[PDB]
Structures are given as C-alpha cells and as structure tokens.
Point group: D2
C-alpha cells in the first residue's frame, strides 16, 4: 500500500460513507461458494451432442457456440432440463458476501444467476428490490437495487430467464432494454468496484466498450479488484488504466497459494472495512488536513457553541 492502494481506498471509503458505493459481483465470488461453473456445462453439452467428451485445448469458437447447438439441435426441453441438474443445488454464503454488505452499498449489480447474494441479504437482513427481468423496473419496491443483469431462476429453471446461449448475448440490448439502461445510470451516478472478474471477461469488455463513447471526463473511473494467481503485468496495468479501470491487485498485497483464491478476496475486502477508521493522519500536515475538513465550512457561521463541536468531530 504505497501510493495507489492508499489513494484508491481513500476514494472507496469516502464513497461508502456517502451512500454512493456500488459493487458489481461476478461469478468468481460465487465460485468460492462452490456453485457450479460454466465450463462444466459446455463439456456436458459437448458429450450429449458430439457423443464423446472433448479432449481439451479448447477453442473459444466451440465454447460459446455449443450450448446454442444443444438448443438448435436437441430442442428446448432438453436445454433447460440439464440446467435443472447442474444449477438446482443449495450452496452456502462465503464471507466475502458479508464483507461486501458490511461496506453498506447503495446498489449491488451482478452477472450471477444464483440467489446466493440474494440469500446473503435476507441473512444479514438487507432489503434490496430484486430486478432480474424487465418487468421489475417499474415495480421496484425500494430505492435500493439488486440488479441481476444476466437474469435469475426465480420464475423457474428455464433458459428464457437467464442469458446463457450465444443468441442471448446478441439480443441482450433488445430483449433487456431497461436492465441495460438502468445499469448505465448506476455506473454514471455511483462509484463502481468490480469484484469477481478477470480483465478479459465478456462483460467487462462490453462495458469498457461503452465508456469509450462517453466524454473525456464525464464519468468516474470504476475500480477493479484483481484476484488472479500471477502478479499483474505492468503492460496490462497501463492498458486498462488508460481505459476506465483503476486496478487494485490482490496479488500485490498478500502472498498466498496459487489455488487459494479465498485469501486474495479476503485481503482487499478486509482492508477496506478496517480503513473506515481513518489512520491516514500521520504527517503533521495531514493532521491539519483532517481538521480543515471539519471546521472551515463553519467559517460561514460567526460563532459556534463548544458543545456543538462534539457533533462536528463525530
């Protein structure tokens, strides 16, 4: 925590106490809860289609297009039958979900289609109006959103309700025109921390392809938590920082196992919670920074009571 980490947490925690922090949860947070992954269904939809399981060294063009082929060839009731076999499980809540909700966010957006962030909010007892379909934006019960942008399975374990095929990602901006637009209102008006992604994911690339179209300084740059095993390369860190991402690297704060992802999620997410107790005023001209931040608004007044200043200094 030399210069960038202590400047990033000085912005995240100064938005958490304003009610202006929004977390964007991915699948690598629910994968820590051992919720089944999407490699495990392309290989399943390869062996019921091509007869035998694939060898590997797997081309991306045979990855995205195969669960569509299992839809176009094997039909529809075959497609949403295996979703009732590999997703119809119960998994528990991992303590990154509680560390997210300890930050008191204004919204939570997710590309997850499990109700694990949705069971971690009635467990801690937080009321989010869950928007998983398009008919839920005009029926929001609160001002505080759990916006599942890739759908959910509350209406059933059918593929009509979740974005999984390759015909779904080309009709996303026409079958979900209000979830997509409500998401970009939140990115424009809040501070976005990404957690659970990998700097080349389809969602993060299709969301940095929108922010290029915006003006030069209209948005604030979203934060990014990178929990990859290898340290980040500075060519990659230069590229995404000139694109709309501040990248906090969890592999440059602790040093744990190459297969223990939980330590790198828990590193940054416990660092943020403890940093609300300031501990930044160690220089003598940083003590005067804090005190000017509380008092110099009151120069508009002409005299203050001394018992009112216990309310100024919290």
């Amino acid at each position: 925590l030399d210069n960038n980490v202590v400047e990033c947490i000085k912005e995240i925690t100064e938005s958490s106490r304003n009610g202006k922090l929004v977390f964007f949860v991915g699948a690598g947070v629910s994968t820590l809860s051992d919720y089944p992954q999407w490699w495990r269904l392309v290989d399943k939809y390869h062996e019921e289609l091509y007869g035998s399981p694939k060898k590997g060294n797997y081309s991306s063009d045979e990855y995205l297009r195969i669960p569509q082929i299992f839809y176009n060839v094997k039909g529809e009731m075959a497609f949403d039958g295996i979703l009732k076999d590999f997703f119809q499980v119960d998994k528990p809540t991992n303590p990154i979900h509680d560390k997210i909700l300890a930050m008191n966010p204004a919204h939570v957006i997710t590309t997850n289609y499990d109700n694990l962030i949705d069971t971690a909010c009635w467990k801690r007892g937080k009321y989010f109006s869950v928007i998983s379909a398009e008919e839920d934006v005009a029926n929001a019960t609160s001002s505080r959103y759990l916006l599942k942008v890739a759908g959910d399975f509350r209406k059933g374990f059918k593929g009509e309700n979740v974005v999984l095929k390759e015909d779904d990602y080309l009709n996303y901006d026409q079958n979900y025109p209000l979830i997509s637009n409500l998401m970009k209102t939140i990115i424009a008006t809040h501070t976005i921390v990404f957690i659970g992604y990998g700097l080349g994911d389809y969602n993060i690339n299709m969301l940095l392809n929108w922010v290029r179209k915006l003006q030069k300084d209209s948005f604030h740059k979203p934060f990014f938590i990178r929990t990859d095993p290898s340290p980040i390369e500075n060519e990659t860190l230069i590229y995404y920082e000139n694109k709309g991402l501040r990248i906090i690297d969890a592999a440059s704060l602790i040093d744990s196992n190459e297969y223990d992802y939980l330590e790198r999620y828990s590193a940054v997410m416990d660092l943020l919670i403890e940093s609300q107790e300031n501990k930044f005023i160690t220089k003598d001209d940083e003590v005067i920074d804090y005190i000017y931040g509380k008092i110099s608004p009151l120069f508009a007044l002409q005299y203050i009571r001394k018992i009112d200043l216990k309310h100024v200094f919290e």
Copy 2:
C-alpha cells in the same frame, strides 16, 4: 376516463413517484420568448423579411443551421444573449407543479424558470444541464434540462437548437439520454406543455415501442389545445402509451385563453390531493380507514402521532 387518471397522479405524488416533463407551453404562460420569434430574426439577417407562407417545416428546421454556417458561431450566440436575458416571473402553473410535489422535473426548456421556483421552497433539486453534471451531482432530486441550458454561457454550443444537434444528440449527450430514460421506466411521467407532434415526444414514443408490453407504465399527457381532441386520435395515442387528459373536454374557454385550461387540470389534481371532493358519508369511512388500517399492527398509538397520520 378523467377520474382514474386523477387518482393515479395523486397517489403517485404521495409516494415520491411523480415526475413532470415540462415543455415550452408553460414557459410562455410566464411569457418567455418562443423559438419561432428567433427564427423570424434569423430569417431577417440572412434574407430580407419573412414572407411567412405558414412556415413549411423545411425552412422551420434549417434556418438556425444556415446562419450558423454562413455568418459564424459568434453571431448565433449573441442573438440568444439578446432574446433570452429577459428575467421573467413564474406563472401559477409552476407553483401548482411543485405543490404537486415532484420527485424530479424533466424539461426541454433552456430557461431558468423552474429552478427558481424550486429554490423558493423547502426542497433542493440537482440541476443537470450539461454532460459533466451527471457524476458531480448532489442529492438524487434532479431538474433534468435535456436540451441544454444557458447556466454556463449564452453560446450556442450549450443548448441544442440546430439540425446538427438533433441527429448528434446520442453522440454528444449519451448520459443525459440514459438518465432521462431511467426516470421514465421507474417513475410516473406527466407531460406539461407539448402538442402531440414534437421532436421531444415522438422521439420518446419510438423508444417506448422498443420496450415490452407491460414493462413500463403509460405516461400521462395533459393536453391543452383549444379545439378538443377527437376519439380516433385518442385511440392512436392511447395505443402508443399516452393517457391523455384533455383540458378542452372539462371546461370551455376562448381559443386564446390558455391559463384557464392549464389550471383546470392542475386544480383538479391538487384539490384531489388536498381533499375537497368528499360526500355521501361512505367516502369518509374509507378516507379515515386508509390512514388507520396500517396502524392496526400496533397496540397503541401516541395521540401526538395521530396528527401526523392525518397530515
């Protein structure tokens, strides 16, 4: 019917879910210079004098763009600085709009008239006029000036007036469209001061066709035209997602008297909110019930809190 529209505007005003969409037809009840008086002035520096001809629209759209290209952008700015440094009052319509307690006010106007009425009461509205003000905003009540405003200059770049500004609106202003469209799907939208053919209304009705069947609520369109609406035009626009309360179909007035029609609907909304129509004595045994049926889940209520129940 009129009566069900009376209800849905009132009980959305009591929930923090009422947003107006204020047009140029109530900035001129407070008598602000209309845009057709500008284009007559632009017609006189380029050409001799406007031989009117009822203004076919091909001249009505291009004449600000032609004087922009020929004379220079400096002259396009000072004519706006001539016609719009006027300092006009507020009509009773603005007072009746804010007494209907909006969450937001969206407006196509480049005047400052609605913000000054919002400063004069106990509520603060975050003015967004430009593209930068979306992130650096304050307090989640928004006066959204979607056409630009002269709050940072009388130059012609800040406001959209030309025809290089209508077709580049999605490029130059991406975040003011997304925040305009988010308020529409969430809140209950009432239009004030439009005329059912507009670049701000028909560009909305083309976006609403791109949505699903029940994925939105239908906006209300308070229509104040002297000749009343016909049923088939009321069929065509109710099918496109506008519930039109016509002001000429509730009172009768002259073809030049606007404030009577604009207030006969706004008094019909506020005096529905400020309850003045209660008779038959079985309408009092469900106004009191609706304020006390929540309080059956409590064993005892303090008598100083029941005054806040009954407002």
Copy 3:
C-alpha cells in the same frame, strides 16, 4: 459549363443512373398522394379538412386509417385510386434518351415502367425483396417503395409511417442495393424539392461517407422561384451540385413542363 459536361461525359461510358421522383409523376397526370390524404382525412374524422391539416400527410392520418378504419380497407381505397392508367410524359421520353444504366425511383406507378419497353431498353424491375436475387439481367430497374405488380394490396407500397422507419429492416437488400448503385455510378435526381423525406435521409447517409470518396450527386431544381445565395451555398456542403432550370428560362408560376423539359433538352442537345 462543368456540370453540363460531366453528365454527358458519363453518358458515353454508360455509367449513368437516374433517381426519379414525384415531381414527374404529376406531369403524366398520375395522382399525387395528398389526394389520398384528403380522403384519409374525411373517412376517419367524418368531415373534411375545412382548415389546413398539419402533421397528417406522411404523419398521422394514413397510419390511423390502416388500423382504426380497417386493414384490408386501407387497400380498398388504394385500388380505387391506383387501378388507373395515365399517358407517358416527354420527361420519361427525355430521360431515357440519355441511356441510363439503372433508374432508381421512389415512385410506385407503372409509368416509368410503361416508357421503357415502349422504347426498346431492357430493365428488370427490382421493387420487392424476392426481386433482388431473382433477377434476369445486370441491367435492372430499382423501385425503392414498391409497385402493385404482385397485387392491389397495402403491404407492397410504402405509404404509412409504420413503413418509413422499418424500411431499413423489412426491405434490407434494396436499401443496400440502392446505396451500391450510388457508390459506383453517378446519380441524377429529378422531381424533388429540397426537404422531402428522401433528400435528407440520403444526405444523412452521405455524412457517413468519408472525404473525397463519392461522386457528388445531381439535383435539378424545378421550383419556379429562383435560387437564393444562401440555400445554394448550404447544399453545396451537404453534397449537392445544383443545376437550376429557374436560372435558365423564365417561365410561369404553373408552367411545370416548361422547366422540367428545359434541362432535359439542355442535356440531349449537349450529348454530342
């Protein structure tokens, strides 16, 4: 004299294409469309337009007549006014003397179609989408709105406002092919005023073409008023070269054919 040379210069190479409009389908005495808009008015409202109707023509009245009055009944009036026959003007004879490689037209009669086989030039009519691939020659005729060749029904002619937005989706190939003909040949317009639906919808498409990369088209003005110094210099930037008939012959306020046949005689005399 530069603009009168290049049109004839493209005539010898056979790389010339004409864009044909509705200022010419009145000189053959074929019905202008607002006669229908007048009928569309008084069969929906119930009483005629004593006042000036505004925002109904291409805007609100044909669209409402399709669905409130009835769907097959919208074409019941179309067959009543467009199962007619009208004689070929000399403009359809004067244009064809310049040997067009193709003819694009927004008109929907068979009056540029009855002038072609009555001369001896073979054009295959691509007016619908099953006409695009299924063609008989590389010398094809392009009708971008349609024609009643399949029958007297409403869904073959672009008339409403539920067709001038999803024309770039329901007619996707013709809309592609029309742009292709502009990209190779040289396009001459006729029978439009500045400010129709299709002179602005094309120069919005021309802003999506880069610098020095297209042939700037030919748009001849046959409005009996003269050309301003202002409106001329404006449409030089949007891409248009203006040859003005009103700056060539002094004509009456209603002598239309004296202006349309003026520039057509200016071309054919300058052919050799």
Copy 4:
C-alpha cells in the same frame, strides 16, 4: 448431394454469376505468415518471454491491440514490415480458382498472392483496397479487398488487424461493406479458405438471419479441414445458410496433407465442366 452442389456452382460459373469468397487458408499454403505468428512476436516483444500452452482470450484476440496502444505505431508497423515484405509464389489453388471464370473475387487477405495471380492471366480485376476505390474504379469487375492492401505503404492504417478495427470497420469502410453484401445476394458465393468457427464467417450468417425467408442464393462451404465434419455441426451451419462440402468426406488424407484436400474439391469443379 455433392453432385447437386456442383451443378449449381457450375451453373453460376457458366452464367457468369460465380464469386469466390476467398479465405486465408489458400494463402497459408504459400508460406505466407499466418496471423498466429505475428501474435507471438507481439507477445514476445511486449511481455518479454512468450506464453506457453494456449493463449488467453485477452491475450489472443486483444494482444496486438494491447501492443498498439502500449508501444505505439512506429513499432507496430515495424513488425508488419518484417514479415510481410517478402516475395512468394502462387498455389496450384491459385490456378483453379481464376480458371472457373469468377465475376468478382472477394478476399480477406492483405497480400498480392490472389492479386498477382490475376495479372498472370487475362482476367483483369480492379483492386478495391481503400475507400476511394469504389468510385475511382475503371471497371465493372472488382477485386474486393475487404481488409486492405499494402499498396499505399507498410502502415497499419491500411489493413484491419487490431481489435478496435474489427469494430470501427463499419465506420471507416461503409461502402465496401455495402458493396460486399450486394454481391452476396446477386452473385453466388463459394467460401474457400476458412473454417467453421472463423470470425468473418459468423458475421455473414448474422446478416443472413436478418434477411427474408428465400431472399438469397444460399451459398456453399468448402471445408478443407483435416477432420470430417460432424453430423450435428453439419445440420447447424446449414440451417444458418451454409451448404457444407467437406474434403475429408470425399477423400482421405494425412493430418498435414492440406493442399491435396484443398485441390481435390477443386478437382470436382474443373473436371466437371
């Protein structure tokens, strides 16, 4: 049937309505640098050491785009001159295609290997490389280089290779996009030199499902893959509008006997007419 596909391809060959949508595998035969080679030099000169195994999605589909922004443009075209300034001979494939009398030749390749093969014979195709070339053409016969040519120079502005240029291509080449899909509906298209799963194949099938039910001459796919085509994948890509002709179904060849599988499918077209 394999005969029924040939009878339509030969009919458009005789009627003059045949256009070969030229792939890159017909130029991978002539020792021209395949694009996985440039990805390595962009990887090794940037990350220091090359990556083992297989590349990541941001490191295969975006690693020249990472290379262009981080390093620049003088060093991006410094590598393009090092592999693409060579002299090469034409295939036997580059003799069977032009002898089928094509109307237009639509390529994806940025080299003059399908181009100088035209100059050897009497077939005169006009190179449509830049945006100016559609209106500056002197012919009705077009060599439609939809990716570009190095004829102006060795700059990277002339070929679409990066990641933002498979996205800004509809804004920097709008007529060539319009001129290509013209030829797809009018002329009959034969795809030779690709694989099912290529990038520019699946963009055309997206434009296919936009069109009407029977609006287009549903083209043919010449599969020069070493493996045989699966029956499931055959029905899928055909229903999207690609009649699949496989060399592995006709002949049997080795895992690196490519040029025989490239030629044998063209042997059933030259000998058939």
